[PDB]
Design a protein around this ligand. Sequence first.
Ligand SMILES: O[C@H]1[C@H](O)[C@@H](O)[C@H](O)[C@@H](O)[C@H]1O
Ligand SMILES: [Ca+2]
Length: 289
Amino acid sequence: QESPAFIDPASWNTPFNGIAQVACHNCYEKQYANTFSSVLDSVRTLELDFWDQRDAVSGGSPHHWFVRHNPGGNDNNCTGGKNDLEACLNDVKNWSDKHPGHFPITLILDKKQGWSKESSGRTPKDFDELVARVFQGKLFTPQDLATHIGSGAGALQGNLKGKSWPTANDLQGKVLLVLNHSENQKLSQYAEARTSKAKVFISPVTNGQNDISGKVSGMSSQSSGYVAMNNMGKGDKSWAKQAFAYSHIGRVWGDDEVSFAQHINQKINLSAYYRFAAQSAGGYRIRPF
Ligand SMILES: O[C@H]1[C@H](O)[C@@H](O)[C@H](O)[C@@H](O)[C@H]1O
Ligand SMILES: [Ca+2]
């Protein structure tokens, strides 16, 4: 079990949903960290923005995605033009291998384009196959959570209410992958394709109760039932209290002028900051609420 100074030791025996963290915002960018791996000196929740194409219209290849911020190749601080998604994911895998006993790592995979058809090799299945090939047994997935709470994975949404996630100690050495997109439709498409086999948690844009516990905006009812995480911008952060009530992992981004301690008091699990190292509460970046 690791013990970097930034983790409150009380965290280990706390259910994962009861833990507040400082997270990065876009920390794959060179301007926010010298290397992607260095982020893990400060936090356990990271972010990658991934694109199908080299620019907006051209340059894709099967089984491969690029990592950069703007529409336009690769522009990031991951190991490596061959510093692609796979390279960034391998940076995390390698850090994990070098720190047995680590607090679970959460990676926010912020998808920037749509899914491809089969022939282009960038379907939801292709994505799962990539992340599985890289992380292997390190992943903790929605089916794993569903088994933990005694639910079907397609009924996590509502069956999580009143339940505890595994503790951080139970999740030592694990990696949790989270899918985001500006359009919830792309999450619905991923969940309809992968169902209980999904390697990645979907975390929809959340601006109403239905996005936590009902038919999520932009998704089918079937996809909605897989929701165990919720993603909020600054203006929607009040929804974190309901994510907390439903034992969904809530993330808030864009609220950098509010302190970690204040986000804790707002029941936000993952508080995303550009300047992550500069945030703490009582010297910690990970602590129970
Ligand atoms: O630009 C935002 C921001 O990058 C967030 O960190 C992310 O979770 C979103 O999905 C995105 O649209
Ligand atoms: Ca992003």
